Structure formats: C-alpha cells, structure tokens
A paper describes a structure:
Among the neuronal KCNQ channels, KCNQ2 and KCNQ3 form homo- and hetero-tetrameric channels and are responsible for the M-current, which contributes to the stability of the membrane potential. Each KCNQ2 subunit contains six transmembrane segments (S1–S6): S1–S4 form the voltage-sensing domain (VSD) and the S5–S6 constitute the pore domain (PD). The C-terminal domain (CTD), which contains three helices, namely HA, HB, and HC, interacts with the calcium-modulated protein calmodulin (CaM). Here we report cryo-electron microscopy (cryo-EM) structures of human KCNQ2-CaM in complex with three activators, namely the antiepileptic drug cannabidiol (CBD), the lipid phosphatidylinositol 4,5-bisphosphate (PIP2), and HN37 (pynegabine), an antiepileptic drug in the clinical trial, in an either closed or open conformation.
To decipher the CBD and PIP2 activation mechanism, we then determined the PIP2-CBD-bound KCNQ2-CaM structure (KCNQ2-CaMCBD-PIP2) at 3.1 Å resolution. Like those in KCNQ2-CaMCBD, two CBD molecules are clearly observed in the map of KCNQ2-CaMCBD-PIP2. In addition, between VSD and PD, one PIP2 molecule is assigned, with its fatty acid chains switched by S1III/S4III and S5II in the transmembrane region and its inositol 1,4,5-trisphosphate head group pointing to S6III helix in the cytosol. The inositol 1,4,5-trisphosphate group interacts with positively charged residues Arg87 in S0III, Arg89 in S1III, Arg214 in S4III, Lys230 in S5II, and Lys327 in S6III. The binding of CBD and PIP2 induces a large structural arrangement of the CTD and CaM, as well as S6. Along with this rotation, S6 and HA, which were connected by a loop linker of residues 330EKR332, now form a continuous straight helix. Consequently, the coiled-coil-forming helix HC, which is directly connected to HB, rotates by ~40°. This structural arrangement of CTD and S6 causes the bending of the S6 C-terminal half at the conserved “PAG” segment away from the central axis of the channel pore, resulting in the opening of the activation gate with the shortest diagonal atom-to-atom distance extending to 8–9 Å at the activation gate. Therefore, bound with both CBD and PIP2, KCNQ2-CaMCBD-PIP2 is in an open state. The binding of CBDs likely stabilizes the PIP2-bound state by pushing VSD away to ensure a sufficient hydrophobic pocket between VSD and PD for PIP2, enabling us to capture the CBD-PIP2-bound open-state structure.
Numbering used by the authors:
A (entry chain G), C (entry chain A), D (entry chain D), E (entry chain B): 70 to 184, 195 to 367, 535 to 600
B (entry chain H), F (entry chain E), G (entry chain F), H (entry chain C): 6 to 148
The structure:
C-alpha cells in the first residue's frame, strides 16, 4: 500500500522521465496523438476540408488536453519520488524548472483558447512539438556537431557565399537587359541562391548564352560547396553518436568492476582459517554450518562476478584493446626490470662465490 | 581433508534440502532469501551454470567440494582485479585515494557496509598512506 | 542414375536457393525477363504505343508465366534434397513457408487473370518484383542500418520537421496576401516540403521580398538537414557490408582451423614408433609398407593444411591482428612468469649453496 | 606608461592579428557590420526599397569606413611590436605585404567613391568581404583538400562530363524535331547540365517518350556522378581539419616536454650534497636556510611539470599510443638483449666454476 | 648523337606514355586544345554565333589535327624504345593495341571528314575526348568502386526502384482524373522519377491534396534512397585511392630495401682483413691505397642507404606499424624461448653442481 | 637410419610406381584413390608444391626422406595449433569443452570418425575434466 | 636525519611565515615573488595540490619532509624523460644534437640561461660528441 | 692502430686531393667517377651529411678515422636488414628462395653482378638449402 504507493510513484516517474522500454511506447503514442493534432490543424486550414477537419480537431484536441493535464499532474505528484525533491515543497520546487515552465505555459494558453485563434493554435502546436524532446538531446547533438566541425562549416559558408555573390553578379551583368528576370541585383541574388542550392524553381533562369555559360561554370562549384554541409553534418552525427556509445560502454564497464572488487574482497575476508574477519560475518548476520555455507555462496558470487566483469571487458575499439594491453606491457616492463635486478644480484654474487 | 569433507557435507545438507545430492535452483533461492539476499531466477541460473560443470542444472558433491577447495590463486584473478582497479583509477597513477574507495565501495555493484570498507582500508593502508597501490592489494589477496 | 538424380536435385536446389556463380546468371536473366515485362506494361499504358506494346506483352507474359511455373515446380520437387524436408511430405511442409505462399498466390492470380485487369496486372507485377529478392537481404540491411543510426535519423527528422514547419509558417505570414500561391497554410507547407527537399517544382515560390529572404534563410538549413539522411544511410550501408564481410572472413578462418587440427592429430597419431594408435589406423583401413605410405600421406596433409590455415590467418583489420598478437602477449606473460618463478628458485638456492 | 604603452600595443596587435577569445568577438562584430553593409546595398538595388535602404546605407558605410580607417591605422602603429618590424621603418616595411596592399587599395577606392558608382561599390564590397579572412585559412584548406583528392575529383569530372555530353546528344537526337526546347545541341547541353545537377529549372525538358527514357537512364548515373564531389570535399575537409588538430596536439606536447626536461635538470643540478652546481644557483640568485627552500621550490616545480607533461601525453589516436608503446617495446628488446648477454656470461662461467 | 637519339626517343616516349612532371603540362595543354575544339563546336551549333564560331573552328581543328598526327607519328616512332617493341617490326606490333586502333580510327575519320557532317564531327569529338584518358584509370577506378560496393549499390537500386514504382502508382491513382498531368501511368512514372531525383522540372506535379500527401510521404524516403549512391561512390573512391597510395608506398619501400641489402653485402664483402673477397673487388676494378678508399666508399654507401631505407620505413598506417612491431614481437618470443631453454639448462645443472 | 632408409625406399616404390625416382601427380592421385580418398588436381598440385623444393612438379628421394625425418618439433606448429584452438574457443577461457570437440571434430574440415575423437579425448583428458586446456594439448603434442 | 630535520624546520619557517604549521598559497606567492619568479594563483594551487596529500589547501611538516626525502628514483621519471627527449628527437636516432639542445633549452618551457645549458652539456657530453644519447642522460640522472 | 692510422692517412690523401684536410663534395665526385660510378650533387651532399658530424660540408680526419673504425656491430643494422629481407619475403616464412635472391639482387637498388650473388649464396647457403633463413644471414653478417 504505502510502500506500493512509493514504488508506483517511482515506476511512473521513470516512465514519464527517462524511458527505456514500454515507456518509450507510451511516449511514441502521445507523440502520435500530438502529430495527428498538428496534421488535423493543417487539414482544417484547407478550405474544402475545413468542416470535417475542424469537427474532428475539436474532439482530438480535448483528448490531447486531458492527456496533457493528467501527464503534468502525474509529473508534479511523482516529482517527490526523487531524493532531490520530496513532499509538496519538493514538487513545487521541481515545477520551477524551465521545461515545466514551457509545459505549464502551453497548458494555460491551450485552456484559455479552448475555454484569429488559428495563429495562436499554430504557435501552441509548434511549442508542444518542441516540448516533445524532454531532454534537448537532438539540439545538444546538433550543437556539439556544429561546434566540432566549426572550421569546415565556416569555410563552406565563406566559399559558398563568395561563389553565390560572384555568380549572381556576373549573371546579372550578362542578363541585365536581355532578360527581365534579372532587372535588379536582388533578383540575380535570388536566382543564384535557388540555383546553387539546386532548388531551381524556374521563375528566374538565364536565357542569354553568356549568362548560361557563366551560370554553368559557377553552379558546378556552387552546388558542390552548398552540398558540403550535409555530408559534414552526417559525419559529425555518426562520430558523436559513436562517442556517446563508447562512453556508455565504459560506464557499463565501471559498474561490474565495482561488483568484482566487492565480491573479491568479500570472498577474501570470509576465509574460514583467517581471523579478525567479523567485519564481514556481521554483514551476513545482519542480512539473515552457516559459516561454510556463507563461504560457499561468497566464493560462488566471486566466480559469477568475475565472469560478468570479464565479459564486460569487450574491446569495442582498437584504442580500448591497445590501452588494456599497454597496461600488461607496463607490467611486463616491471617484471623484466625485476629480473634484471635479480640477475644483477647473481652477477654480483658470482665473484663472491668464485 | 576428512574433517573438511564433513564440513562440506554439512554445507551440502544445508544447501540440498531435498537430500537427493543435487542442489536445485529453487533450493538455492530459498537459502539465499534465508540469508537475506534476493536473487533472480536468471541470475541464479547463470550463477549455477558458472558453478556447474556437468551441465545438469544442479550440483553434485564433487563439484561442490572442488569449488570449496578451489583457491583463488588457481582462479588467476590477478589481471581481472588489476583491470578493475585501473578502471577505478581515473588518473593511472597506479594507486587510488581512500575517499574514492569510500565512495565506490558503497555505491556501485554490491554496496558494502561501512565495516567492510573499514576492513578494506585496514588491510590496504599497510603504509598508512590512503593512496593504496591497487597492484599491491591484488598481490596480497593472491598471496 | 538414382545417385545422379539426387545429385542433380541438390545442384538445381542450390541454383534456385543460395546461388554463387552461374545460378546468379540465371537469376539475372529471369530478373531481366520480369523487368522487361514491367517496362512493356508501362509502355502499354502509353496511348500511342498501346497496340504493339500489348501485343508483345501478351507473349512475353505467357513466357514469364511458364518460366515461373517451371521454377516453382522445380523448387517444390527439389525441396526434398535438404535433410529438413524429404519426400512428398517434406516438400509439402516446405511449401508452407511464407515466401512460397507469396509465390503461389502470385502464380494463381496471374493464371486466373490470363485464363479493369490493368490494375490487377500492375499489383501482380509489383508483387513479383518484390519476390525477386528471395532472401530479404536488401530489406534486412536497410532495417539494420536504420536501427543502428536510429538516433541520428530521428534527430535529423525532428530538426528538419521543425525547420519545415517554421519556414512554411513564416513564409505563409510573409506572403498571405501578396502571393496567391500561399493562400492557405497547407499550400505553404507543400512549398516548404518541395523546397527543403530541393525538388523545387516551381508551382509555388515566394515573390514578396520578405518571403524570399525568409525562404533563403530557412532553406539553407533545411536543405542541409534534409540531405543528412542520405549520407547517414550511405555510411551505415558501408559499415554493415564491411561487418558482414568480416564475419564471413572469420568463418572462412574457422573451417581451415578445424582442418589443421584434424590433420595435426591424424599425423601425431600415425607415428610409427608410438603404440595404441590403431584407433587412427582403422580409419585409413576402412577408407581402403602401407603403414609408411599412410604416414607420408598424413604428414603431407598436415603440411598443406598448416599452409592453408596460416594463409587463412590474414590480418584483414587492425583489431584482428591486435587480438592475435595479444594472445602471444599473454603467452609472453606466462613465460616470463615462469622465468620469474625459476629465478626465485635460484635466489632461494643461493643461500643454500653458499 | 611606456612599458604599459608597449604592452597595450602588443595586446591590441594580438587582437587585430591572430585572435583567440574576445578578439574573435570583435572580429565577428566587424564582420557583421560589413555583412549588414552588403545586405543594405542589395536592398538598395531593390526599386521599391531604394530610398530608405540608401539612406541607411550612407551612414552605415561612413561608420564602416571610419572603423576600417582606425583599424588600419592601429594595425600600422602596432606592427612595430613584433621583432620583425620595429619603429616607423618597420611599420612601413610591414605595410608592403600584399594583404595590406589589398586593404589600402580598398580603403582608397572607398574614400574616392564617397568623396555608375553602384558597380564600383559592389566590387569594393566583394573585395572587403574577401579581405575578412586575413589568413587564407579557408582558401588554403580548400586547395589542400582539392589537391589531396585530385584523382577522385578529376575522375568524377571526366565521368560526369562524358555522361553530360552523351545524354545531351542522345536527347537532342530524340527531341530534335518534336520539341522546340532542343532546336540546337547547345540547348540540349544546357538541359543536360541543369538536369544532371538536379537544378531542373523546367525551361527545357524532354516531352517525347524516347527522350524521356534516355533522360531517365542517363540522369540516374549523371546525378550520382555530379553529387560525388560534395561528399569527396566533405570527407577531405574533415580529414584535413583532423590532421591540423593532431599537429596542434603534438606541438602542445612539445612545449611541456621542454618544461619537464628543464625542471628535471634544474632539480638534478640543485642537489644539496653535490658540488660544482653554482651554474644553477646563480640563476635563482639573479632572479632574487635559503638553499633548502630553493631546493624545495625546484623539486616541487619538477613534480608539477612532470604531472603536466604526463597529462599532456594523451593518446589522441591509435597511431600515437602505438608509437609511444613501440618506444617501450624497443626498450624491452634492449633489456632482454642485455639479459641474454648476462645469461651467456653465466653459461660461460658454468664450465669454469665446475 | 646516336646514344643521344635513343635517349631522346626514350624521354619523348615517357612524355607520351606514363608522365610525371612537365609531360603532364603538355598533356594538359593538348587536353585544353581539344576541349576548346569541343566548345567551339557547341558554339557553332548556336545559330546567332554560327559564322564566327565555325570560322575559328576550322583553323583550330586544322591545328588540332596536325598536333594529333604528329603526336601519333612520334608515338609510333618512339615505340621502339621499350624492349617489348624494337625496330620497325616492334613499332608495327605495338600499333596493333586496341587504344592505337581507336586513335588511328579517329585520325582517319577526321582526315576523311576534313579532306550531315555535324553528327560525324560530334561523334569524333566524343571519341577523342574518351581517348584523352590513355590508361583507363578513371574507368578502372569507377569499375573497382562499383564492384566493391556492389551490394550497397544494388540494395539502393532495388529499394529506390520499388519506392519510385509505388509512389508513381499511388499518385497516379490519387490524380488520375483531377490532374491532366497524370492521365497515364507512364506520365506518373516520369513525375516520380524527376521528383525522387529532386530534379523537379515542374511540368508534372500533384495538385490534389491526397496526391500531395502521398507525394511528400514517399518523396522523403525516395530522395534519401536516390541520393545514397553519390555518398557510396564518394566513400568508395576515397578508399580505393588510399589503397592505391598504400601500395605505391610499399613499392617505394621495396626498392630501398634492395638498395640496403646490396650495400650491406658489399660492405661485408669489402672487409680488408677477410679473404676470398675478390668476387666483390672485381666489380670495383671493372667499374674503374685504392683498397682502403674503396672500403670507405662502401661503408659510406652503406650508411647513406641505411638512412634512406630507415626513412622509407614510415608508419603510413596503423596496420603497417602493427606488422612491423609484430615482427619484433615474434623475435622477442624467440629470444625469451632461448632464455627459457638456458634457464632449464641451469636448473638441470643445479642438482648436478650440488 | 639404414633400416629407415629401406622402409622409405619401399614407400617410394609404393608412390613412384613408374620407378623413375620422381613421383608424378597422377601416381599420387592413384595411390590416394586406392587409399579411398579422392583429391583434386589443384589440391594435389598444392600438396606437391608444399613438399616440392626443386620446382620440378615431382619429388626426388632426398626430399621424401626429408619429409619423413621432418619431426613436427621442427615444423613449429605450436602457434598455429594454438590459434586454431583459440578460434574454436568461443569464450577465450584457455580451454574447450568436450562436447564442442565432439561436434566440431566430426563436422568441420575433414570430418573424423568417432574413434579419432575418442583417442583425442583419451590423450587430452589427462585430468578427466572434459574442458581440455588446448594449450596443454598442443604442448604434449609438441613434447 | 635530525640535522636534516632541523634544516627542513628552517625551510618551513621560511615558507610558513604565519608560523601556524600550514603553508598558505599566498605565503608561497610571496616567497616566489621574493625569489624573482611570479606564479599564478591557479598555477600555485594546482602545484600545491600535486604536493598536497591531506586535501587541506596547505601543507603540514610531515608532507614537507616527505617531499624533501622524496628521491627522484622513487618518482620514476625514467619513462617521462625518455618520452620528452624522444619528442625532441626529430629523427628517432636515440640521440640529439647539441645545437638543438642550445635552441630548445633556452626557448621552450621555462627558458634556462646559458649557464644551465653549459652544465647540461658538461654532464651530458661525457664522450664529447654533442649528439648526447638521451637514454644515457636519463640513466645517469636516475643513477 | 698506428699502421691502420697511416693507411687512413693514405686514404685521406687519395680523397682529400687538395690536401687541406677537408674533403670537398667535388673531390668526392671526381674520385667517384674515377671509380666508375657517377653520383649526383644532392646524393653526394646527403652522403657527406650522413657521415658529416661537424656540419661543415666536409670531413676532418677524426671523422674519417671514426667511420673507418666504425664497425657495423655498432651501427646496429640487425633490425634494418631484418626488415629489408622481410619486405622481400613475400610469404613471411622467415626464409627466402634462392631464385628470388637472384632476381632481386640484380634488378633493384644498386644492381649487383652475378659474382656478388654467387658469393652471397656461398656465404649464406651454409646448409645448401637455397631457402636461406635471412635471420641467420643478418646474424652471421653481424657476427
Ligand atoms: C573545386 C571543386 C569542387 C571540384 C574540383 C575542380 C573541378 C574541375 C570541378 C569541381 C567539380 C564539379 O564542380 C562538378 C563535378 C561533376 C561533373 C561536372 C561535369 C562537367 C566534378 C568536379 O570535380
Ligand atoms: C554506376 C552507379 C552510379 C550505380 C550503380 C549502377 C546502377 C544499377 C545505378 C547507379 C544507381 C543510380 O544511378 C541510382 C540509384 C537510385 C535508385 C534508382 C531507381 C531506378 C541506385 C543506383 O545503384
């Protein structure tokens, strides 16, 4: 009941906060609901579909609002689970976080609207869509990748901007009079942009052959330099995700290392023959012929924990095995130094024994 | 020897409640929760598999007393303990501060009581330095 | 005859099932036939080409159906080779597999149609085209790559969707009245989609300068984030193919390792001087001065197998050689530990001999 | 004052020359100013916005020119800090550099214009935008990447050009008469270019079905080969930036190595017991019971410097750790050779002692 | 003269055949000449530029033909240099190679045309442009990359083709009646192709909202899968070029290894004290106090060659250093095994000496 | 020795049917298929080449006696056998279970009869553990 | 010993101006500026921390005597000095030219005066070659 | 010794034609083309530099006698020759066939006449195998 109450509070907090399994399914379902709300809004904007679209949108939005309200209430009521925030004071303290500010502002705006509204609805929908992240993971990853490849991205921007400016100016000069698409340099800049990005609307295109040749010569280089950032960002995304996975692997290594050291010390301090080991026997007594059984379970725990840790020492990378084996190489250096010292002792004794 | 054989017989009787000579995973679970620790079915299964040698899902007496007589020097855990402490040595100095031991020993894996870390430091700070050389510690557990 | 019958059945089953060499050529030819059928259907849809296109399509489709029927019958009749499925019962059991269900459904639909049909023909053609894979290799590879890069792909989708929504809304605001292309937010969303993908049909484009400026400022980022997935998927495809090749290399290593161990034991147990070796001599007797000839054969086989295995231990990778050499490094650890023990014995004797 | 004068000159030169922190902020602000000037010029080209755009442009350009003048004067006056250029003669010698030639030519052209001018203004703005780099870092990086991947880029150009020529010619043949878009081979070449680059203006497109099929078959391959250079350049940019970062890491390693060797020698030559060490004591005296305090200072500096160098030996790469550990492996080879020599001595003595 | 004649023949053959330095400049100039010929032909196709374009084209083409003929004659006359082809018979034998067949066919076609011609001129221009390669390097590289990434490319083709077919069919169904762009499935297929490739001509686009929704939903995935091959090919090109560079590095290693072994044997066999070394002294005598001078020459050559080879053993890669160090690791295994044998001898003597 | 030389002469006569002193690939093929094993022409070519040292496509008597006297200590197969068993040691424990040996021995490479695996375990299970230390097995094969 | 303890007491009194038994970072700053070298607050803090063992921000007498008695052989700087000289050995020959030492010693890190490099070469050019084998230098410094 | 010192006097007189005690690159070039081999100016420059120790562009007599007395055991060319032969050991067997030596010795680097390869195999084919163990070759060349 009470213990079950706290257990359920913690479990639901885990579901709402960092999810792993089925909590991800629930988050996907609520994401699908909000995405359907946005799609229904877009449909309602269509004139021929306005009636039924809005009719369904009203009910789907009331469902969305009740779901959001119950989610926020459960968040506040489960905020006491963590040791950081406990009780009503702790929950209110947690509610002060900026993300909770965003959630509550969206909630109050939505309830005010429900109880020219199209633009406010659009803004609120965009805000909740942004709210879907709940961790800034996407934004943090994008920022990290941009910062990591800042030099390449800035070089691409500089080269592409110079190419765009020069190509637009040259085509404008080559098509100032003949073509009415390029009556002003701003039109030429718009053309250069929609060409170097390969969008090519077709509203403005060169028609004079000098303009066509200049456009070709510059658009080759321009499209190359404008497509550069996509590849740069893809490589950066992959690299950063791999780095995060490596860090997670190393933490998953850290935990079984503690397990192994714990079990090894327990096994060594539960030896039957040795004395002054009450510091370990007292632990088993508090948890509770029995001595030998305790020793057996302890040594078997050590075996299983050593197996777990050894499996946890997967290479996962070239650098990882290189470091692990370099530890052993330093151990070899120490051992061979010891052998050198012993052989020095032997050669010193040689004259003595002769 | 014979006296240790009798001690292992008493231990097996404590484990093998059914008395059939084979320890069942359920019997191991019962004795564990009697000891105050709650293991999981898959955890206990992998546990016995690690201690199992005949691939039967249980243990006969010879495997049990072989494990009981199985000294850790034979186990060859020098490298494993070395790697664990190196993992917990964020600097690579070849040692580890006492406060880091206090934090880690009672926060990850199977958290140990303050008494356990007290005996750990007792048998670790042989020189009374606090920055125990983990290599020396594993060497001492081996010897 | 009978043994030849089973051999031919196995060979043809291998041809239909996993092919390596010329069976791939046969599969390519049948794929070309079905692709020509699809192309002829598409041509038949063209009005000015309908007569001759349909005339050739009828005969090419009858050829396709007879080829498909003979292939399916040969598959069923050759399904008995594998130990999993033998005899009529085994063949019928194999026919229950979902892929055989798809093939038989396509066959019956085609024969019913031949013996508003254009849409059914189109559906059947797409179904057989999908059927061409026969192993889901492409689909499995795509799914594995998508799952592996789930975070990067989802981040790209989230950021690109937010960019599309915001750009479409801003351009809609900037061109609500002046431009008739953006009379509704749905039209603006369509424009944003066909721009950020760089398709740029040209049916809708901004014309107001505020709209043009917003479109540029947003389309740069949007095209970057919309082109991200292509690079991500390319990298994933390459990585997964390399991983599969590495696994295949390791299996090709596994087999000659068994060969080497087999030959080594055979040659060690064929030694002339050693006794209690009839357990190996009986095998050679069953296969059938002969003793020395058999030993020569055995040592020769050991030599060739050792050569094969050693060649099979190609590096192929940094990690592979790192692991192979780490094995030897552990061996060095053991040997130097033994030398340390022996030197400890020597230093213990030192006081004794003095 | 005077020393403060030289210190301020050097600091402001560092801000103006290679920047690290807030000097980058100042450079970003001046870049934003010049970019706003360019944007205002582009706006002034727009007819409906000409009045206010030009009105703001005049004042923003006078601000830009005063900022540029003060920056150039401060550059000339701070050019004396470096040992290469000192005094008025040194500053005038530095002003001869080609980049300063570009800056001064831009300045004089701008002041002449201020005190058909639209084209001159555009040229001057482009020139200063190019001038923003101040180090050719972007141009050097692009040239290095192009040279490094010269073979791949040239192969892509050759294949893509052949594909463009062949596709344009074939579509021209297939659409010579039916379609007025392809009345000349030059028009077909323009179409092939704007297709293979995926710009697709829509001014020219095949309409005959033979032309459409040829365009499809060739445009697949053509778009692949035309999009190749973007990926090639992205990979090259990433690789070159990583190489530069590695070199910077190795220099950051080089400096603490000197620190460590310096401190080690100082600590070894400041030993209390040893004599003939006045060469080290004199340094600490000219910098100025005291002797032991100096020894403590020296050994303590050695400890901190050793820590700095050790943390400076970060792997940063697989090759780096491989080289560092190969040094130790060669050391191990030497040590084991020494042990072999000593064991040879022992085995030589064995017969003698027997 | 005669020796100079053969030297010049070899030098010019190297210029025409595999060039390294300034022969590349000559090849670039002739490439520029032929490219100008092609550009002038394309210009001549333009009606308003026909007169002057053709006038310049005639003279530029006569220059091109004279240069081409003299180059071909010099190739034939310099083909006698190589040991494979010597004399008139050797030159005629070499002229049989398929590339010379292409060259001679182009020459005869050009001379026949010069001494409906526009189409033949275009074909000849394309043929000579293809001829510019002279080694198939680009074609070989592209084929190698395609074969290496066959699985990824085929998977991309399969998935993209299925996506194109399905999207075109669905849009055709959604726009069969409302839109006249999609009156036939072939038209819808053309739209789907020019959409998924992101060419987006704009001649055909969906207008019904069901069609627009389907087009968006499918074009996202379709453009991803259609842009996949560009990245795949870029990665393959980079990998293959790196592999070729590695092989070239290993050959540049192979040659100085022979140099080092040669010099080492010469220095070991030029020792003054050792006898039976006339086999090396005769070499120096035939090349021609002198003995010691020759030995000094030999040791100096050994030093310089050892330096050259050691510098030639650059890392260049992780695998390269791993292999080089694994050689030493095996050597260490052998040395430690020898030490183990010696220690076994010592422990056997232990009981004996006691 | 001399008697071993006579035995090798009898063996060579058995192989070199023509008696010309050179073993032809066809002679080796016929003796193989007489033994009951069918080799391929390329396989036999690689075979003879692995023995062939004079580059003649055949083997003279000195090479035959060299292969006969070639003890596997000289061959230096310790590393190769170690690597093979490591390949088949899916865990890296330094040993291998008996059941895995039974499965692989008679299902991979040149499948061996049950008698061969029986003698394998007989000369391998010296400690009667089943989890034979493959390193010890190769060491005893070498010794 | 006792006399060295008294010398260290004099040194501590010179350092610990306050006389409270704890050397403050500010006291270290004053003594450094008296010595003619100006350190930074963060530099001095990390410096004492590398010297600090009790985590107090200062140093007690036992730590001062520990660092005074801390012979560099215990420090194990062989590998570090080896790596530094290898870093400055642009060729990898195992040595380094005298001119490179003249340039580097007086231009990098804490630039040393000509006298320091003179004594460096004096105790380094034992063979009078100039191309000092830095392995020998580190070995003698250790010895 | 003194007699070898006078022999080196004669050698230097042969090299140092000018007699100033400094060997000029032009003197080395003329003596080389007298010997029948034509070096390049940069090649001879790198030559002297590798032998040059005083950084003067020439060689004083002490350096010449150092190079004369410089035995190849000091040079430590074991690893270099090992790597060269491994480069030419396309199989990694630890040996190399005689025919490959005949081809390589007279086709790459500085091609050697048939006499040189004949003496090479004479002093290398100690066991008359042809598949010379290049490890043994470098070891004997060192010994
Ligand atoms: C400086 C860049 C970006 C490279 C390198 C220099 C040159 C010759 C062209 C660029 C480039 C293209 O811009 C486009 C292609 C595709 C084929 C174009 C058909 C003419 C290849 C191609 O290398
Ligand atoms: C020589 C290149 C560049 C490859 C390999 C050969 C072939 C089959 C096609 C090229 C290619 C495309 O040009 C386009 C796609 C995307 C799907 C196209 C839908 C029909 C895949 C695809 O492999």
């Amino acid at each position: 009941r009470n213990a079950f109450y706290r257990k359920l509070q913690n479990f639901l907090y885990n579901v709402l906060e960092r999810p792993r399994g089925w909590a991800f399914i629930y988050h996907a379902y609520v994401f699908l609901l909000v995405f359907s709300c946005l799609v229904l809004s877009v449909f309602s904007t269509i004139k021929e579909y306005e009636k039924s679209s809005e009719g369904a949108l009203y009910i789907l939005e009331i469902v969305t609002i009740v779901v959001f309200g119950v989610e926020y209430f459960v968040r506040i009521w489960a905020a006491g689970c963590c040791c950081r925030y406990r009780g009503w004071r702790g929950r209110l303290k947690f509610a002060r976080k900026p993300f909770c500010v965003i959630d509550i502002m969206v909630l109050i705006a939505s309830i005010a609207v429900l109880a020219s509204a199209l633009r406010s609805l659009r803004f609120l929908q965009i805000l909740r869509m942004i709210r879907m992240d709940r961790r800034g993971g996407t934004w943090k990853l994008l920022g990290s990748v941009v910062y990591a490849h800042s030099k390449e991205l800035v070089t691409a921007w500089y080269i592409g901007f110079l190419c765009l400016i020069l190509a637009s100016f040259l085509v404008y000069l080559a098509e100032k009079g003949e073509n009415d698409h390029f009556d002003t340099y701003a039109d030429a800049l718009w053309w250069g942009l929609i060409t170097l990005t390969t969008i090519g609307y077709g509203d403005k295109y060169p028609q004079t052959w000098n303009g066509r040749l200049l456009a070709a010569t510059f658009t080759l280089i321009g499209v190359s330099f404008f497509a550069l950032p996509a590849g740069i960002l893809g490589s950066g995304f992959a690299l950063k995700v791999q780095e995060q996975h490596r860090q997670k692997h190393f933490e998953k290594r850290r935990n079984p290392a503690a397990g192994l050291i714990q079990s090894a010390w327990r096994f060594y301090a539960t030896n039957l023959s040795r004395t002054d080991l009450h510091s370990t026997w007292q632990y088993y007594e508090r948890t509770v012929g029995l001595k030998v059984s305790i020793r057996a379970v302890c040594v078997m725990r050590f075996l299983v924990s050593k197996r777990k840790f050894k499996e946890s020492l997967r290479p996962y990378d070239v650098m990882d095995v290189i470091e692990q084996y370099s530890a052993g190489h330093l151990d070899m250096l120490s051992r061979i130094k010891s052998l050198q010292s012993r052989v020095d002792q032997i050669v010193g004794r040689g004259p003595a024994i002769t | 020897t014979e006296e240790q054989i009798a001690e292992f017989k008493e231990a097996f009787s404590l484990f093998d409640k059914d008395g059939d000579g084979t320890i069942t995973t359920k019997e191991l679970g019962t004795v564990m929760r009697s000891l105050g620790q709650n293991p999981t079915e898959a955890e206990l299964q992998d546990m016995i598999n690690e201690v199992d040698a005949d691939g039967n899902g249980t243990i006969d007496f010879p495997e049990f007393l072989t494990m009981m007589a199985r000294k850790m020097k034979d186990t060859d855990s020098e490298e494993e303990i070395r790697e664990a402490f190196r993992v917990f040595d964020k600097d690579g100095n070849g040692y580890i501060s006492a406060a880091e031991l206090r934090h880690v020993m009672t926060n990850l894996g199977e958290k140990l009581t303050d008494e356990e870390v007290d005996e750990m430091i007792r048998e670790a700070d042989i020189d009374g330095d606090g920055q125990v050389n983990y290599e020396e510690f594993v060497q001492m557990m081996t010897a």
